[PDB]
Design a protein around this motif. Structure first.
Motif, mmCIF file in Angstrom:
data_model
loop_
_atom_site.group_PDB
_atom_site.id
_atom_site.type_symbol
_atom_site.label_atom_id
_atom_site.label_comp_id
_atom_site.label_asym_id
_atom_site.label_seq_id
_atom_site.Cartn_x
_atom_site.Cartn_y
_atom_site.Cartn_z
ATOM 1 N N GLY A 27 10.116 -36.897 -0.458
ATOM 2 C CA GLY A 27 9.974 -35.629 -1.138
ATOM 3 C C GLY A 27 9.228 -34.587 -0.327
ATOM 4 O O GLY A 27 8.684 -33.632 -0.892
ATOM 5 N N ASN A 71 24.281 -30.679 5.701
ATOM 6 C CA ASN A 71 23.427 -31.859 5.701
ATOM 7 C C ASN A 71 23.028 -32.163 7.121
ATOM 8 O O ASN A 71 23.395 -31.469 8.075
ATOM 9 C CB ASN A 71 24.181 -33.113 5.273
ATOM 10 N N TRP A 104 4.407 -33.790 7.894
ATOM 11 C CA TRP A 104 5.702 -33.659 8.550
ATOM 12 C C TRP A 104 5.602 -34.316 9.919
ATOM 13 O O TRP A 104 6.562 -34.916 10.393
ATOM 14 C CB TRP A 104 6.053 -32.187 8.710
ATOM 15 N N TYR A 114 12.831 -40.539 -3.032
ATOM 16 C CA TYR A 114 14.110 -39.930 -3.310
ATOM 17 C C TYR A 114 15.273 -40.470 -2.489
ATOM 18 O O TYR A 114 15.566 -39.960 -1.411
ATOM 19 C CB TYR A 114 13.969 -38.420 -3.108
ATOM 20 N N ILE A 130 18.766 -41.182 -0.798
ATOM 21 C CA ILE A 130 19.767 -40.212 -0.377
ATOM 22 C C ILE A 130 21.176 -40.794 -0.326
ATOM 23 O O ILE A 130 21.425 -41.770 0.374
ATOM 24 C CB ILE A 130 19.421 -39.649 1.010
ATOM 25 N N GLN A 166 12.704 -36.185 3.405
ATOM 26 C CA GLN A 166 13.343 -36.103 2.093
ATOM 27 C C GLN A 166 13.076 -37.334 1.264
ATOM 28 O O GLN A 166 12.762 -37.254 0.085
ATOM 29 C CB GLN A 166 14.847 -35.972 2.239
ATOM 30 N N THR A 167 13.236 -38.482 1.888
ATOM 31 C CA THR A 167 13.024 -39.758 1.235
ATOM 32 C C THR A 167 11.673 -39.845 0.514
ATOM 33 O O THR A 167 11.530 -40.601 -0.439
ATOM 34 C CB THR A 167 13.177 -40.878 2.285
ATOM 35 N N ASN A 201 13.900 -35.413 9.323
ATOM 36 C CA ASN A 201 14.217 -34.656 8.131
ATOM 37 C C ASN A 201 14.685 -35.570 6.994
ATOM 38 O O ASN A 201 14.215 -35.471 5.863
ATOM 39 C CB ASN A 201 15.264 -33.612 8.459
ATOM 40 N N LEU A 202 15.595 -36.478 7.289
ATOM 41 C CA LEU A 202 16.070 -37.379 6.263
ATOM 42 C C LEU A 202 14.919 -38.226 5.770
ATOM 43 O O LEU A 202 14.809 -38.481 4.569
ATOM 44 C CB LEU A 202 17.195 -38.254 6.812
ATOM 45 N N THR A 239 8.935 -31.589 2.713
ATOM 46 C CA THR A 239 9.734 -30.532 3.300
ATOM 47 C C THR A 239 9.787 -30.853 4.776
ATOM 48 O O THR A 239 8.781 -31.257 5.359
ATOM 49 C CB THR A 239 9.056 -29.149 3.152
#
Length: 255
Positions: A149, A222, A75, A211, A213, A146-147, A142-143, A151
Protein backbone atom coordinates in the motif's frame (compact mmCIF):
# COMPACT_ATOMS: atom_id res chain seq x y z
CA UNK A 1 6.59 -27.90 -19.42
CA UNK A 2 9.15 -29.76 -17.30
CA UNK A 3 9.53 -27.92 -14.02
CA UNK A 4 13.32 -28.26 -13.93
CA UNK A 5 13.53 -26.68 -17.37
CA UNK A 6 11.50 -23.74 -16.09
CA UNK A 7 13.34 -23.45 -12.80
CA UNK A 8 16.91 -24.30 -13.65
CA UNK A 9 17.49 -25.09 -17.31
CA UNK A 10 15.66 -22.75 -19.67
CA UNK A 11 16.81 -22.67 -23.31
CA UNK A 12 14.08 -20.62 -25.00
CA UNK A 13 12.52 -17.17 -24.47
CA UNK A 14 9.20 -18.92 -23.87
CA UNK A 15 10.67 -20.61 -20.76
CA UNK A 16 12.01 -17.28 -19.58
CA UNK A 17 8.68 -15.45 -20.01
CA UNK A 18 6.78 -18.30 -18.29
CA UNK A 19 9.22 -18.02 -15.39
CA UNK A 20 8.68 -14.24 -15.27
CA UNK A 21 4.93 -14.73 -14.99
CA UNK A 22 5.53 -17.26 -12.21
CA UNK A 23 7.75 -14.72 -10.50
CA UNK A 24 5.00 -12.09 -10.68
CA UNK A 25 2.61 -14.45 -8.86
CA UNK A 26 5.13 -15.42 -6.21
CA UNK A 27 6.20 -11.88 -5.56
CA UNK A 28 3.17 -9.64 -5.85
CA UNK A 29 0.14 -11.86 -5.29
CA UNK A 30 0.69 -14.97 -3.18
CA UNK A 31 2.64 -13.37 -0.30
CA UNK A 32 0.02 -10.66 0.19
CA UNK A 33 -2.85 -13.13 -0.08
CA UNK A 34 -1.43 -15.48 2.57
CA UNK A 35 -0.55 -12.55 4.80
CA UNK A 36 -4.11 -11.25 4.66
CA UNK A 37 -5.59 -14.67 5.41
CA UNK A 38 -3.17 -15.16 8.30
CA UNK A 39 -4.44 -11.86 9.68
CA UNK A 40 -8.07 -12.94 9.22
CA UNK A 41 -8.54 -16.48 10.56
CA UNK A 42 -6.91 -18.81 12.99
CA UNK A 43 -7.82 -21.60 10.66
CA UNK A 44 -4.81 -20.36 8.68
CA UNK A 45 -1.97 -21.43 11.01
CA UNK A 46 -3.74 -24.78 11.33
CA UNK A 47 -5.20 -25.30 7.83
CA UNK A 48 -1.89 -24.34 6.18
CA UNK A 49 -0.12 -26.64 8.65
CA UNK A 50 -2.22 -29.56 7.44
CA UNK A 51 -0.71 -29.12 4.06
CA UNK A 52 1.37 -31.46 1.95
CA UNK A 53 4.85 -32.22 3.21
CA UNK A 54 7.11 -29.26 2.53
CA UNK A 55 4.55 -26.47 1.83
CA UNK A 56 3.77 -25.68 5.50
CA UNK A 57 7.25 -24.30 6.18
CA UNK A 58 7.47 -22.59 2.79
CA UNK A 59 4.23 -20.74 3.46
CA UNK A 60 4.67 -19.97 7.15
CA UNK A 61 8.11 -18.55 6.43
CA UNK A 62 6.96 -16.33 3.57
CA UNK A 63 4.42 -14.92 6.00
CA UNK A 64 7.16 -14.33 8.55
CA UNK A 65 9.33 -12.76 5.85
CA UNK A 66 6.44 -10.60 4.62
CA UNK A 67 5.39 -9.41 8.08
CA UNK A 68 8.80 -8.67 9.54
CA UNK A 69 12.06 -9.13 7.62
CA UNK A 70 11.04 -7.47 4.39
CA UNK A 71 8.12 -5.31 5.53
CA UNK A 72 9.06 -1.94 4.06
CA UNK A 73 8.69 1.35 5.89
CA UNK A 74 9.91 3.52 3.06
CA UNK A 75 10.08 3.72 -0.76
CA UNK A 76 13.84 3.31 -0.40
CA UNK A 77 13.13 0.06 1.41
CA UNK A 78 11.21 -1.11 -1.66
CA UNK A 79 14.01 -0.05 -3.99
CA UNK A 80 16.44 -1.87 -1.74
CA UNK A 81 14.34 -5.00 -1.77
CA UNK A 82 14.15 -5.05 -5.57
CA UNK A 83 17.92 -4.67 -5.87
CA UNK A 84 18.38 -7.52 -3.42
CA UNK A 85 15.92 -9.70 -5.33
CA UNK A 86 17.66 -8.87 -8.58
CA UNK A 87 20.87 -10.18 -7.06
CA UNK A 88 19.12 -13.28 -5.78
CA UNK A 89 17.74 -14.21 -9.20
CA UNK A 90 20.36 -13.00 -11.71
CA UNK A 91 23.47 -13.48 -9.57
CA UNK A 92 23.31 -15.59 -6.41
CA UNK A 93 21.03 -18.41 -7.56
CA UNK A 94 22.98 -18.60 -10.81
CA UNK A 95 26.27 -18.94 -8.91
CA UNK A 96 24.59 -21.60 -6.78
CA UNK A 97 23.51 -23.61 -9.85
CA UNK A 98 27.05 -23.36 -11.26
CA UNK A 99 28.25 -24.68 -7.92
CA UNK A 100 26.12 -27.84 -8.14
CA UNK A 101 26.90 -28.17 -11.85
CA UNK A 102 30.19 -26.51 -12.86
CA UNK A 103 30.55 -25.45 -16.52
CA UNK A 104 32.78 -28.46 -17.09
CA UNK A 105 30.57 -30.97 -15.29
CA UNK A 106 30.34 -34.35 -17.04
CA UNK A 107 27.66 -37.05 -16.87
CA UNK A 108 28.35 -40.60 -15.72
CA UNK A 109 28.45 -41.44 -19.45
CA UNK A 110 31.27 -38.92 -19.81
CA UNK A 111 29.13 -36.38 -21.72
CA UNK A 112 29.06 -32.63 -20.93
CA UNK A 113 26.20 -31.87 -18.52
CA UNK A 114 25.75 -28.40 -20.03
CA UNK A 115 24.92 -29.60 -23.53
CA UNK A 116 21.98 -29.88 -25.93
CA UNK A 117 18.73 -28.45 -24.56
CA UNK A 118 20.88 -27.01 -21.78
CA UNK A 119 22.61 -23.67 -21.76
CA UNK A 120 25.19 -23.04 -19.08
CA UNK A 121 24.39 -19.68 -17.45
CA UNK A 122 26.62 -16.92 -16.10
CA UNK A 123 25.85 -14.51 -13.21
CA UNK A 124 25.09 -10.88 -13.99
CA UNK A 125 26.68 -7.82 -12.42
CA UNK A 126 24.37 -4.98 -11.42
CA UNK A 127 24.86 -1.72 -13.28
CA UNK A 128 22.54 1.23 -12.79
CA UNK A 129 23.54 2.60 -16.16
CA UNK A 130 22.21 -0.53 -17.81
CA UNK A 131 18.66 0.26 -18.92
CA UNK A 132 17.54 -3.34 -18.45
CA UNK A 133 18.79 -3.39 -14.89
CA UNK A 134 17.05 -0.12 -14.05
CA UNK A 135 13.89 -1.18 -15.93
CA UNK A 136 13.72 -4.11 -13.55
CA UNK A 137 14.13 -2.24 -10.29
CA UNK A 138 11.67 0.48 -11.34
CA UNK A 139 9.03 -2.16 -12.08
CA UNK A 140 9.75 -4.55 -9.19
CA UNK A 141 10.05 -1.84 -6.53
CA UNK A 142 6.81 -0.23 -7.64
CA UNK A 143 4.91 -3.50 -7.66
CA UNK A 144 6.48 -4.34 -4.30
CA UNK A 145 5.46 -0.93 -2.91
CA UNK A 146 1.84 -1.51 -4.05
CA UNK A 147 1.80 -4.84 -2.30
CA UNK A 148 2.17 -2.95 1.00
CA UNK A 149 0.00 0.00 0.00
CA UNK A 150 2.93 2.35 -0.49
CA UNK A 151 3.27 5.02 -3.13
CA UNK A 152 6.08 4.31 -5.54
CA UNK A 153 7.83 6.53 -8.05
CA UNK A 154 8.66 6.63 -11.74
CA UNK A 155 11.62 8.94 -11.23
CA UNK A 156 14.47 6.94 -12.74
CA UNK A 157 17.07 9.49 -11.67
CA UNK A 158 15.91 9.36 -8.07
CA UNK A 159 15.93 5.58 -7.89
CA UNK A 160 19.37 5.52 -9.52
CA UNK A 161 20.55 7.85 -6.80
CA UNK A 162 18.95 5.81 -4.01
CA UNK A 163 20.57 2.68 -5.45
CA UNK A 164 24.08 4.09 -5.07
CA UNK A 165 23.64 3.69 -1.33
CA UNK A 166 22.21 0.16 -1.49
CA UNK A 167 24.56 -2.53 -0.21
CA UNK A 168 24.16 -6.14 -1.20
CA UNK A 169 24.82 -8.95 1.30
CA UNK A 170 27.74 -11.05 0.07
CA UNK A 171 26.75 -14.49 -1.15
CA UNK A 172 28.47 -17.85 -1.25
CA UNK A 173 27.07 -21.12 -2.65
CA UNK A 174 26.17 -23.70 0.00
CA UNK A 175 26.64 -27.48 -0.06
CA UNK A 176 23.36 -29.29 0.56
CA UNK A 177 21.21 -27.51 -2.01
CA UNK A 178 18.86 -29.76 -3.97
CA UNK A 179 18.48 -28.74 -7.61
CA UNK A 180 16.46 -31.38 -9.46
CA UNK A 181 17.24 -32.32 -13.05
CA UNK A 182 14.20 -34.51 -13.71
CA UNK A 183 10.64 -34.17 -12.42
CA UNK A 184 11.50 -36.59 -9.63
CA UNK A 185 10.71 -34.97 -6.31
CA UNK A 186 11.28 -36.63 -2.92
CA UNK A 187 14.41 -29.34 10.83
CA UNK A 188 10.95 -30.51 9.76
CA UNK A 189 8.87 -29.87 12.87
CA UNK A 190 11.22 -27.81 15.06
CA UNK A 191 11.94 -25.16 12.42
CA UNK A 192 8.16 -25.21 12.07
CA UNK A 193 7.57 -24.88 15.81
CA UNK A 194 10.05 -22.00 15.95
CA UNK A 195 7.86 -20.09 13.50
CA UNK A 196 4.69 -20.72 15.54
CA UNK A 197 6.22 -18.82 18.47
CA UNK A 198 7.90 -16.31 16.15
CA UNK A 199 5.02 -15.24 13.87
CA UNK A 200 3.72 -12.03 15.47
CA UNK A 201 0.16 -12.18 16.76
CA UNK A 202 -2.45 -10.57 14.44
CA UNK A 203 -3.56 -8.25 17.27
CA UNK A 204 0.02 -7.06 17.67
CA UNK A 205 -0.28 -5.57 14.16
CA UNK A 206 -3.32 -3.22 14.18
CA UNK A 207 -4.91 -2.49 10.82
CA UNK A 208 -1.93 -3.82 8.90
CA UNK A 209 -2.85 -5.30 5.53
CA UNK A 210 -1.44 -6.14 2.12
CA UNK A 211 -2.73 -5.56 -1.38
CA UNK A 212 -2.50 -8.62 -3.69
CA UNK A 213 -2.02 -7.71 -7.35
CA UNK A 214 -3.87 -9.51 -10.13
CA UNK A 215 -1.83 -9.74 -13.31
CA UNK A 216 -3.23 -7.67 -16.20
CA UNK A 217 -1.30 -7.90 -19.43
CA UNK A 218 -3.55 -5.46 -21.28
CA UNK A 219 -3.28 -2.28 -19.21
CA UNK A 220 -0.15 -0.70 -20.70
CA UNK A 221 -0.19 1.85 -17.87
CA UNK A 222 0.80 -0.96 -15.51
CA UNK A 223 4.25 -2.14 -14.69
CA UNK A 224 3.02 -5.70 -15.13
CA UNK A 225 4.40 -6.14 -18.63
CA UNK A 226 7.28 -3.84 -17.72
CA UNK A 227 8.20 -6.45 -15.12
CA UNK A 228 7.59 -9.49 -17.31
CA UNK A 229 9.77 -8.14 -20.11
CA UNK A 230 12.55 -7.07 -17.75
CA UNK A 231 12.48 -10.14 -15.51
CA UNK A 232 12.43 -12.34 -18.61
CA UNK A 233 15.15 -10.66 -20.65
CA UNK A 234 17.46 -10.63 -17.64
CA UNK A 235 16.99 -14.34 -17.11
CA UNK A 236 17.47 -14.80 -20.84
CA UNK A 237 20.78 -12.93 -20.59
CA UNK A 238 21.83 -15.34 -17.84
CA UNK A 239 21.32 -18.26 -20.20
CA UNK A 240 22.60 -16.60 -23.38
CA UNK A 241 19.09 -16.51 -24.80
CA UNK A 242 18.17 -13.82 -27.30
CA UNK A 243 15.96 -11.13 -25.67
CA UNK A 244 12.44 -10.36 -26.87
CA UNK A 245 11.14 -6.79 -26.91
CA UNK A 246 7.95 -5.75 -25.08
CA UNK A 247 5.91 -6.40 -28.23
CA UNK A 248 7.32 -9.81 -29.17
CA UNK A 249 7.18 -10.73 -25.50
CA UNK A 250 3.46 -10.00 -25.17
CA UNK A 251 2.99 -11.66 -28.57
CA UNK A 252 5.00 -14.77 -27.61
CA UNK A 253 3.25 -14.44 -24.32
CA UNK A 254 0.12 -16.17 -25.57
CA UNK A 255 1.23 -18.34 -22.65
Amino acid sequence: IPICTLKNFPNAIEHTLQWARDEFEGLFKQPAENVNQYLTDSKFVERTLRLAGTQPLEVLEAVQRSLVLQRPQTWGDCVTWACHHWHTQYCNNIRQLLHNFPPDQLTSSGAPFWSGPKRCPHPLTFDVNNTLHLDYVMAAANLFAQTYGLTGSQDRAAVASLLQSVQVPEFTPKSGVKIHVSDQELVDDSRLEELKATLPSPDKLPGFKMYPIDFEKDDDSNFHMDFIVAASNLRAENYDISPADRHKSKLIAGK
